[PDB]
């Protein structure tokens, strides 16, 4: 398979960074793409084998190398705000017939000032008494707000076990400031259960959001806590009738 690292990253304009990409399938061909809204997948660089690399559609600002067949790193010397994107690594055997394999992607956001990095405020809203009485069901809502960048992962935990049954989270978060490309986000998720499961006082519900932010090695000179990679959660217990 193809493994890219890191999956999420926040850079400060000017800093350097190296995105890794490896595969154990013995593919001679490897390549890097960047995906941008309303502009699709654009090839940055590619390699047909070890000791050889070539420029793609938009090679400017990036460097690559292919000393071993297994790896193909992408390098950014002076990170620029324009480089904010989602990067993908793809590989295949240079014996066409073999499909193209993509990694999970690396979400990189470059900022002029790291003070625009905000963690989310998470809160769980308990089921309305109108719903329970009308449908015999209860829907818990989890709301994460004011975060930037959009590097989050939201999940529900009931009595210690992650649940997927009766759950839907927004496929994508909404901008609290539609006109800004630097806008903070909001994300919501629903967890629906039978009214009887919610009415049981010993049932524990927990919503958590994993936020990918700054590192412990970054500067931060402000009164509010540094927005490092963290988890923010909220919880609620069943409520008797």
């Amino acid at each position: 398979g193809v493994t890219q690292t890191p999956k999420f990253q926040v850079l400060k304009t000017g800093q350097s960074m190296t995105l890794q990409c490896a595969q154990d399938m013995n593919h001679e061909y490897m390549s890097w793409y960047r995906q941008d809204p309303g502009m699709g997948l654009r090839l940055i660089h590619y390699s047909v084998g070890a000791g050889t690399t070539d420029q793609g559609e938009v090679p400017n600002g990036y460097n690559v190398s292919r000393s071993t067949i297994e790896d193909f790193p992408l390098r950014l010397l002076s990170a620029a705000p324009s480089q904010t994107s989602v990067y993908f690594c793809a590989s295949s055997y240079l014996g066409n017939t073999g499909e193209l394999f993509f990694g999970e992607g690396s979400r990189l956001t470059v900022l002029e000032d790291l003070k625009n990095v905000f963690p989310p405020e998470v809160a769980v809203f308990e089921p309305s008494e109108a719903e329970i009485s009308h449908t015999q069901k209860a829907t818990l809502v989890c709301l994460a707000t004011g975060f930037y960048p959009d590097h989050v992962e939201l999940s529900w935990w009931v009595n210690g076990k992650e649940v997927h049954s009766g759950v839907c989270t927004d496929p994508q978060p909404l901008k609290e400031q539609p006109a800004l490309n630097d806008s903070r986000y909001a994300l919501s998720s629903r967890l629906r259960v039978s009214a009887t499961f919610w009415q049981d006082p010993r049932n524990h519900f927990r919503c958590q959001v994993q936020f990918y932010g700054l590192s412990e090695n970054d500067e931060w000179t402000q009164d509010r806590a540094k927005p490092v990679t963290q988890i923010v959660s909220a919880e609620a217990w069943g409520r008797a009738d």
Binding site: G38, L41, F125, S128, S188, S194
Partner: protein, 205 residues
């Protein structure tokens, strides 16, 4: 030089219906065509790969055809379901050799809506577990033909609609969330758009 276009750019369809996605390319001289699936926050998953000289390629409900002469392929998704919702991208590779750079289309954003056997539209107001006077509104149980529009109010937000399936009772429903960072504001009013006249709006008390 090669240029690939996919139509439609966005497709919305009710489950159970078969779907047809098109991918046309200017140069018929391609080694192979490949379809991918991408879910928000995730990468691209390979669906099918068609060799130049093969014509058809199946994978369960996914059937892909390719007419090299005309320069276009079609992805057929039989009996669609909400699980098929995602962006679909087709990519083609040069048969030439000495050049292996593929070309991606912009993709088709697909959405398969769930079948709501018994629609029961309603907006409920929820309270925060911490009890901070906060609340949010929940528009749920509406039929899949109902569309939610973003509010025309500064401190009011409305999320897109998603489907949740309660496996235990084989029950799936649609929902949409709304809230406002306003001091004492009825969020039920955020849905002043195009909803059903029989939608239930119980008082929060």
């Amino acid at each position: 030089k090669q240029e690939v276009t996919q139509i439609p750019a966005a497709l919305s369809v009710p489950e159970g219906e078969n779907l047809v996605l098109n991918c046309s390319f200017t140069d018929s001289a391609i080694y192979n065509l490949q379809w991918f699936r991408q879910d928000p926050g995730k990468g691209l998953t390979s669906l099918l790969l068609i060799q130049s000289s093969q014509r058809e390629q199946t994978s369960g409900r996914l059937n892909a055809s390719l007419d090299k002469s005309s320069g276009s392929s079609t992805l057929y998704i039989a009996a669609s379901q909400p699980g098929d919702s995602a962006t679909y991208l087709c990519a083609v590779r040069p048969l030439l050799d000495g050049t292996y750079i593929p070309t991606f289309g912009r993709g088709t954003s697909l959405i398969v809506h769930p079948y709501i056997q018994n629609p029961d539209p309603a907006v409920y107001q929820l309270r925060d577990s911490k009890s901070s006077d906060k609340s949010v509104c929940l528009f749920t149980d509406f039929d899949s033909q109902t569309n939610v529009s973003q509010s025309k109010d500064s401190d009011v937000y409305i999320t897109d609609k998603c489907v949740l399936d309660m496996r235990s009772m084989d029950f799936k429903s649609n929902s949409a969330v709304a809230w406002s960072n306003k001091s004492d504001f009825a969020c039920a009013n955020a849905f002043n758009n195009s909803i059903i006249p029989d939608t239930f709006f119980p008082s929060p008390e």
